[PDB]
Design an enzyme around this catalytic site. Structure first.
Site, PDB file in Angstrom:
ATOM      1  N   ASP A   1       0.861  -1.166   0.000  1.00  0.00           N
ATOM      2  CA  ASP A   1       0.000   0.000   0.000  1.00  0.00           C
ATOM      3  C   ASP A   1       0.918   1.244   0.000  1.00  0.00           C
ATOM      4  OD1 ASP A   1      -2.250   1.686   0.225  1.00  0.00           O
ATOM      5  OD2 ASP A   1      -3.277   0.278   1.561  1.00  0.00           O
TER       6      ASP A   1
HETATM    7  O1  LIG Z   1      -3.418   4.519   0.920  1.00  0.00           O
HETATM    8  C1  LIG Z   1      -3.885   3.880   0.005  1.00  0.00           C
HETATM    9  O2  LIG Z   1      -3.239   4.083  -1.275  1.00  0.00           O
HETATM   10  C2  LIG Z   1      -3.461   3.122  -2.303  1.00  0.00           C
HETATM   11  C3  LIG Z   1      -3.087   3.830  -3.608  1.00  0.00           C
HETATM   12  O3  LIG Z   1      -3.952   4.943  -3.858  1.00  0.00           O
HETATM   13  C4  LIG Z   1      -4.893   2.576  -2.290  1.00  0.00           C
HETATM   14  O4  LIG Z   1      -5.089   1.601  -3.309  1.00  0.00           O
HETATM   15  C5  LIG Z   1      -5.177   1.923  -0.934  1.00  0.00           C
HETATM   16  O5  LIG Z   1      -6.491   1.352  -0.933  1.00  0.00           O
HETATM   17  C6  LIG Z   1      -5.060   2.949   0.181  1.00  0.00           C
HETATM   18  O6  LIG Z   1      -4.975   2.264   1.441  1.00  0.00           O
END
Ligand SMILES: O=C1O[C@H](CO)[C@@H](O)[C@H](O)[C@H]1O
Ligand SMILES: O=C1O[C@H](CO)[C@@H](O)[C@H](O)[C@H]1O
Ligand SMILES: [Mg+2]
Ligand SMILES: [Mg+2]
Lengths: 744, 749
Positions: free
Chosen positions: A259
């Site tokens: 993430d």
């Molecule tokens: O912080 C994040 O960034 C990722 C990228 O935008 C997203 O896919 C995740 O669901 C989120 O938790």
């Protein structure tokens, strides 16, 4: 074939170029985190970029792919990622709302359409589906999931992966999916986003893991590692999760992405410096580094010190290259860069009509009581009604375009969505007058409203006081024949980093609602929300309540369809609605305890119960009403006993006993009466959505076999134990018919 | 000797039928005390047949002696009975509820309170107390937080040791020492939703780092018995959980004693859903459960199970031997009537010396939560309301102002509830000739009469009448407007906490908070004297009331102790042992939390993409270790005797604490340690020491803590109790939030 191609490519690669395939910087206008990536043109040139994300537009993506194909030593093409969560430009309902369709065909369709649109615009990879189980409606990210139940969550996970990827991602309108957030992220303590998760292994497997596994078994191309710790180890460094479970147990053949800055955030978690946690992540089975630059800045040094093997590096790199090959990017790097496609594939009337249909199907009718409309007449429900006379549409969600699509609509044109007032005006032109009043702000506290309406969702709060807005609304309400109170959350009161400790309709809106009811005009609550709310007051006092979640770009029209009876609501809840925040966590598939409170016995000293409220949710899992009624006969089991290789059929006649054509989600639950460990009081094990004309009946049949009866015992063996089982079929998880059989 | 015990018990067990061995495992309920639904029958004939190992809930040495005489003289083998009771925070002389008592941070006082309780209980025939309750909880919805010692395992462990030692002494040899019972093993304080008896689930790592230590400490202090909890753990009711009752308790901790169930715990496994009575009873004894409270699972089904091979003779013999060993160790084979001295109650129970101790310990337990300056009169600088000299007209108003029976607190089953002075009564005695005590009830407990009824069960009625809220309020306002100061005696009734007393909202109840608002509106000075068995959500009261004294439930002498605090005979020095949340939606809040990967930096609420809520910050209203004084204390910088140690080493952390105010008083100086980097994530701090110091105005003292690597150990990913090399932060202060910091490095060498 693939193996030979990737062998030959990898033989040519420097260590730096292998490491580069694991690097995923961010760019573009879309903002989904704090840290931003620099100097991207040069990095592609140096071979240090595996993919990018948050870049929108086929032309800009094409330009970047060109640099990768033509200006890097090896010409390795990039993945292009985005959060395509519930639509690209054509926005479907938020996933939690979408789950209430109980319609795997519609869900697959919504993903198919989003993939068509996103692929037409250059995107080859979506960070979807989000399949996290949660029992905690304080967490804003419940909006992105499919509720509390893993059986339904699993079926939805399969439908989304299939919708995005198809058979094998061969078509130029199929993209790679990414199951997130592996794992257990929905159990963050206090419902506070990113907070500590802790549970037994037994709970993981029986209660939380199935949807991730279902996505993996549906052939999902990638998995995203979660922000939370599990067993004291951040998921991004948890080898038990990312290797032993994901690969060892489930046979996942794809790659794992972090993430947003998940690696460098392990420093804050408190498990070491950047090099240490970066080495631990790749050794755990993490393959791609989103934004942190931990892999690209420290892996060479770790390899030189013997902390990471060349073997481990080659495996991570190979997985990234296999994904690119499977997408067809080595055959054609510009597979998704057709400049003619946006005009023919994005935000088309056909797509928007589908979204309108699916939106109306997602709404959950929570209440529709008989009301005295004209004196002398038998009381009738407010919904549906014919659009006539003067229809008041009042509240902070009544005339907001930008709050209609929902959270996680990063590619949508927010201010192109019709507001509820605009859509209802269109749908009633020549037949009724739509009278608008804002009625209240979002919430009394101005600072709260500002953070609740970020990412372009402002309600244009001004110097008019709560009292002024109320007064104007009452003037409008008293000129009307009916009041549509458009109230609830703004879209960014849910989603990421949007946790709430109170789950009411906000103060000033609830006061507005109370005052609208005091006019004596009929009031329908059209409720916008990304989560369960605590609605006991509204259930007591408001005659009709339609939960519209956030229905997408065409929400306004779908709401019209429901209100005016063009669509008969058939949504059913996929997450429990508690009476208060003090009951959290409340979920239907709970253990009995040693001191169960029997039905109707609240309050009883020495039973598992509270002093101040009973144990029940206001609305249980699977709850939802219709403009008609359905009646269930007794359950017919084809056998009273089966062995481990046997099978039976549970059948029930469902009759439409009202005056409206409508759909019913007939729900199958099973209770394993006795276990070597304690078993839930029921588990959803099947369902069928039926459509019936008035007076029409259908015998609904469920096959029941021992594989469906298996669960993870104390030793984490997936087994069905002999003993008695109770089969329950009904209109929700509470109101069911029952019958029993024995497994030998 | 140990060998003499073995020979004696070998010989006795050689005489016993299978039925008699099974009978030793049976614990019916009798007497006038009610702690559960199920009741036993035919006890006299059962004792005669050798079918009874002990009894509980029977009060009074005459009754107990009669029953013991039946066991000794009229059963075939004459095996004496254990007599049990929930002696939780006093027998007749009532000390504060355990949660209040924990705020003394005074192990000597805690031990003393258990000693006194044992003296009184033993005088009246009791050989066995179901105490201490040592369950960790982070969930103030659960009523049983009243019975424990807060959220922290370090403090929890020290208190467990103090309680066991107080009850048992060195070896239970004396006739004023009784057998203790650590409860509820295990994890019962983590029940879902804070709802009593509900599902518990956690990782093994969490169990050992965060919940288990207090049970282990009781076991290592030599506690004679353990009570299995009602909750499931890893999907198995604790009463059938062999990993808990054998592997951990005996295998890892070397427990030599016996395990009793909780109330009908065995038959309740039928409801949990793991089988029929015979099946669950066999599983319980096979798991390491030795004594069956009320359910009659053992007595009605073990012989059939032995015949069928579901339980072995070796398993029955081991359980029976454990019970016989407890009786032997208590001296009951030497003298079955050890605790049946008919003349002890008149000289040992509810004595002035006992009651004076209770009064002292009660005043020591109170937590001063707020005491802001108030301007009483133009031209005179503002001073705090507390303490004040008793003069003029002192109003005491509220539903807790004049209730005798709500003073001792929950779990006071042997107390004479109607003998405890009410707060008005106590303050009247203490101020006779100096001040007029004016009184009005002011409000009911809560608007809902049905709630008030269940909240005041077990003889705690507030004598709610059919007066209107208007009648109640108007009478209180007539009092308030004549008074020089108002003591608002508000909060919980005692049975709003304890067992099966879970709350989903944690406010001062509606009509009492409305009363408080009206009293504040008079413009007279208002002191909130807060009665509670749990953390409450007090943000409104913290904003609006000048002085807030948390008196928990102080026991039978609470009224006098409250007078002592109000009038300045005692300077409050209590410190919270459980976090007070701002709202129920923050639960669970606890100081020893992990950092997360997206920590909200101090003073940065709100920040998008950090671990925080939209509607409130992350902080409790009052943190762990919080408590004020009538004086102020200042802390100098921390001096560490060295900056680097290895596993063989130690260092000293020292800080100068100065009394900078005008009052002598006690400060609890608290030591916290943060292990900055781990192979697993480590809490942002953990309590590892404390010292309660008393300072005169202007006086200073250098407080020194020994820091050794053994204090830095924790259970790693593989459950190895290890200290890892790396950086540590030492924090010392007046609570867990407001601290001085210093760093040191630990190396292997
Ligand atoms: O912080 C994040 O960034 C990722 C990228 O935008 C997203 O896919 C995740 O669901 C989120 O938790
Ligand atoms: O139900 C119970 O009964 C027991 C006997 O009264 C008591 O000791 C436990 O603490 C309690 O949980
Ligand atoms: Mg079974
Ligand atoms: Mg360390």
């Amino acid at each position: 074939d693939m193996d030979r191609f990737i062998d030959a490519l990898m033989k040519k690669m420097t260590v730096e170029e292998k490491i580069g395939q694991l690097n995923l910087p961010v760019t573009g206008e879309i903002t989904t985190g704090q840290a931003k990536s620099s100097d991207i043109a040069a990095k592609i040139k140096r071979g240090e970029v595996g993919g990018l994300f948050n870049l929108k537009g086929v032309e800009k993506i094409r330009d970047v792919q060109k640099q990768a194909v033509e200006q890097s030593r090896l010409g390795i093409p990039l993945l292009f990622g985005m959060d395509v969560i519930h639509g690209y430009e054509t926005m479907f309902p938020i996933p939690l709302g979408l789950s209430c369709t109980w319609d795997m065909t519609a869900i697959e369709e919504s993903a198919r359409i989003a993939a068509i649109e996103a692929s037409a615009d250059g995107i080859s990879w979506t960070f979807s589906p989000m399949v996290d189980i949660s029992r905690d409606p304080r967490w804003g990210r419940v909006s992105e999931g499919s509720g509390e139940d893993p059986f339904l969550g699993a079926m939805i996970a399969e439908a989304m992966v299939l919708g995005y990827q198809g058979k094998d991602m061969q078509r130029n309108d199929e993209i790679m999916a990414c199951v997130k957030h592996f794992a257990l992220y929905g159990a963050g303590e206090g419902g506070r986003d990113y907070n500590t998760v802790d549970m037994s292994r037994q709970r993981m497997f029986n209660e939380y893991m199935l949807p991730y596994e279902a996505a993996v078994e549906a052939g999902v191309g990638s998995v995203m590692a979660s922000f939370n710790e599990v067993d004291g180890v951040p998921a991004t460094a948890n080898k038990w999760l990312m290797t032993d479970v994901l690969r060892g147990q489930w046979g996942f053949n794809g790659f794992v992405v972090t993430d947003y800055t998940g690696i460098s955030e392990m420093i804050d978690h408190g498990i070491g410096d950047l090099q240490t946690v970066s080495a631990r992540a790749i050794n755990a089975g993490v393959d791609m580094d989103m934004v942190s630059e931990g892999f690209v800045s420290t892996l060479k040094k770790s390899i030189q010190e013997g902390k990471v093997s060349m073997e481990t590096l080659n495996t991570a790199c190979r997985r990234i290259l296999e994904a690119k090959y499977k997408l067809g990017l080595f055959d054609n790097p510009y597979k998704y860069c057709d400049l003619k496609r946006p005009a023919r594939d994005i935000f088309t009337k056909a797509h928007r009509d589908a979204a309108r249909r699916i939106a109306a199907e997602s709404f959950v009718l929570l209440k529709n009581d008989n009301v005295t409309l004209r004196p002398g007449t038998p009381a009738e429900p407010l919904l549906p009604f014919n659009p006539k006379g003067n229809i008041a549409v009042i509240g902070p969600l009544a005339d907001s375009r930008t709050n209609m699509p929902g959270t996680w609509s990063v590619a949508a044109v927010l201010d192109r969505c019709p507001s509820l007032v605009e859509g209802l005006k269109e749908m009633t032109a020549g037949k009724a007058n739509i009278l608008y009043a804002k009625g209240s702000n979002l919430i009394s506290d101005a600072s709260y409203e500002e953070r609740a309406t970020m990412f372009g969702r402002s309600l244009n709060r001004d110097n008019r006081t709560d009292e002024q807005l109320l007064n104007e609304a009452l003037t409008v309400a008293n000129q009307s024949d009916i009041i549509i109170a458009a109230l609830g959350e703004s879209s960014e009161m849910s989603g990421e980093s949007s946790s709430r400790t109170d789950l009411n309709i906000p103060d000033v809106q609830q006061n507005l609602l109370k005052e609208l009811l005091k006019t004596g005009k009929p009031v329908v609550l059209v409720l916008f929300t990304g989560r369960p709310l605590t609605l006991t007051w509204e259930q007591e006092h408001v005659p009709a309540i339609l939960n519209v979640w956030f229905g997408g770009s065409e929400a306004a029209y779908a709401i019209g369809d429901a209100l005016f009876g063009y669509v008969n609501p058939g949504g059913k809840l996929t997450m429990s609605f508690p009476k208060n925040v003090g009951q959290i966590p409340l979920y239907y598939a709970h253990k009995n305890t040693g001191r169960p409170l029997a039905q109707g016995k609240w309050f009883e000293k020495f039973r598992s119960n509270y002093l101040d409220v009973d144990n029940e949710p206001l609305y249980p899992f699977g709850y939802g009403l219709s403009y008609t009624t359905f009646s269930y006969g007794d359950i017919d089991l084809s056998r009273s006993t089966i062995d481990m290789t046997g099978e039976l059929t549970a059948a029930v006649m469902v009759t439409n006993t009202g005056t409206w054509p409508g759909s019913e989600v007939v729900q199958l639950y099973i209770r394993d009466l006795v276990g070597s460990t304690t078993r839930p009081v029921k588990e959803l094990k099947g369902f069928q959505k039926i459509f019936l004309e008035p007076g029409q009946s259908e015998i609904v049949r469920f096959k029941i076999a021992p594989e469906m009866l298996r669960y993870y015992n104390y030793d984490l063996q997936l087994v069905a134990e002999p003993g008695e089982f109770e089969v329950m079929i009904g209109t929700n998880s509470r109101d069911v018919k029952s019958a029993r059989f024995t497994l030998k």
